[PDB]
């Protein structure tokens, strides 16, 4: 299964975030990141741990070992506001993790 | 499309048009996405062999299905409990879904 941290994640235009998952067994580097945005389908970023997939700007990056997949956005730009979401796809059935919310900290 | 609103333990059948590939390179997944936002998977088939596995939330209810002729992919849900109310989404599969459904709202009340 999964477990992201955080929920909510407040952060400045410009600004770096980090959102992380951790799963119960290992799980090999198979998980996936999905951004939603608001009103919106989900759609991929990067699968297998950190494999962009293509339309994806590298301001996204994916790392982690073991239990514990990070997704970084280095330069926070005003499109990716919404919710972020990890998956794996060790084990079926895929579990996705319940999802942090970024937040665009404005004036 | 299928959706709508239906009384609880009721039945619906939910279905998917896949279109731009070659359907049977690609499992295709049932997500839903209930209304406080969480995700939950639903189902996996495999349409070429016609294989499908389940969480305990919907096993024995849901049957996922489908035709690789008429590139169709099909949920049948049954005995539809409160919960099963959220947004339904198919998805092509291959170490992920990076298409493709728009949604397809199923209310139980």
């Known amino acids: 299964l999964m477990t992201q941290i955080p929920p909510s994640l407040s952060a400045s235009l410009g600004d770096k975030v980090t959102i992380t998952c951790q799963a119960s067994?290992?799980?090999?580097?198979?998980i996936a990141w999905y951004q939603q945005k608001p009103g919106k389908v989900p759609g991929l970023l990067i699968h297998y741990t950190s494999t962009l997939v293509s339309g994806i700007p590298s301001r996204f990056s994916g790392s982690g070992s073991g239990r514990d997949y990070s997704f970084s956005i280095s330069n926070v730009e005003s499109e990716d506001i919404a919710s972020y979401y990890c998956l794996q796809y060790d084990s079926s059935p895929r579990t996705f993790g319940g999802g942090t919310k970024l937040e665009l900290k404005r004036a | 499309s299928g959706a709508e609103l239906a009384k609880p333990g009721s039945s619906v059948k939910i279905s998917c048009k896949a279109s731009?590939?070659?359907?049977?390179?690609?499992?295709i997944s049932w997500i839903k996405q209930t209304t406080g936002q969480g995700l939950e998977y639903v189902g996996y088939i495999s349409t070429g062999s016609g294989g499908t596995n389940y969480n305990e939330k919907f096993k024995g209810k849901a049957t996922l299905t489908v035709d690789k002729s008429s590139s169709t992919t099909f949920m049948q849900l049954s005995s539809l409990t409160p919960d099963d109310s959220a947004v339904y989404y198919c998805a092509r599969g291959d170490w992920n879904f990076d298409f493709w459904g728009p949604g397809t709202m199923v209310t139980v009340s």
């Open positions: 731009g590939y070659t359907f049977t390179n690609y499992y």
């Open positions: 067994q290992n799980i090999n580097k198979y």
